[PDB]
Ligand binder design. Sequence first.
Ligand code: HEM
Length: 183
Amino acid sequence: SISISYSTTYSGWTVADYLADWSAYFGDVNHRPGQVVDGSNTGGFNPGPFDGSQYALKSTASDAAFIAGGDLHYTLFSNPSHTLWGKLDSIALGDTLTGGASSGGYALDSQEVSFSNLGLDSPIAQGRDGTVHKVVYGLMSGDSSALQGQIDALLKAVDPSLSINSTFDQLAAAGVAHATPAA
Ligand code: HEM
C-alpha cells in the first residue's frame, strides 16, 4: 500500500491542496518541442543519461524540485519518442536539489512531502499514455492532475473513505502517512 511522509508544517492541509500549491511554485519548465536545447529544463537521471533509479528536476521559475524514484527509462528519440516508462515507486517534492553522481544520488535540501511504494509499472508499449509518463511529465509541465489521480486511487484501495481531499493527519490516523519534523 502507498506510504506517505509529510512535514508537520502541512498537518491540516489536504494532499490536493499541497500538490496544487507545490505545482503553482514549480510552474512549467516548458519541456516541449523546439524548447529543449540544453540542460536548463531537461532534469537528469541517476545514473543516466537516459535511464535510472532516479529522475530529478528543478523548476526554472523557483527552487521547487521533485525526484521520481524507481526503475525509469526515457526513450528520447527512439520509438515511442519522448516517453518515460518503467516502474515508478516514489515521488518526493520539496525545494532545492542536491547530489548527482558523487556522494550518491539525488536528494532535496528541504523534502516537504513524499509518496512511496506507489507500485506503478508502465510498459514501453503504452507510450505517452502510460501512467508513469503522464504522472512525471505532468509534474514537469505544471499539471499534477495525473499524480493526484493515482494517489487518490491508491488511497481508496486502502479504504474508500480516504482521498486526496483527506488531510495528511487523517491519512496518518489511517496508518498510511507519517509526520516528520517541521523542518
Ligand atoms: C535526460 C533527460 C531528458 C532529455 C535530455 C530530454 C530531451 C528532450 C528534447 C531535446 C526534446 C525536444 C524534442 C524536439 O524539439 O522535438 C524533448 C521533448 C519531450 N520530452 Fe524530454 N528529455 C528528457 C526527459 C524527459 C522526461 C523525464 C519526460 C517525461 C516524463 C520527457 C518528456 C518529453 C516530451 C513529452 C516531449 C515532447 C515531445 C513531443 O511533443 O513530440 N522528457 N525532450
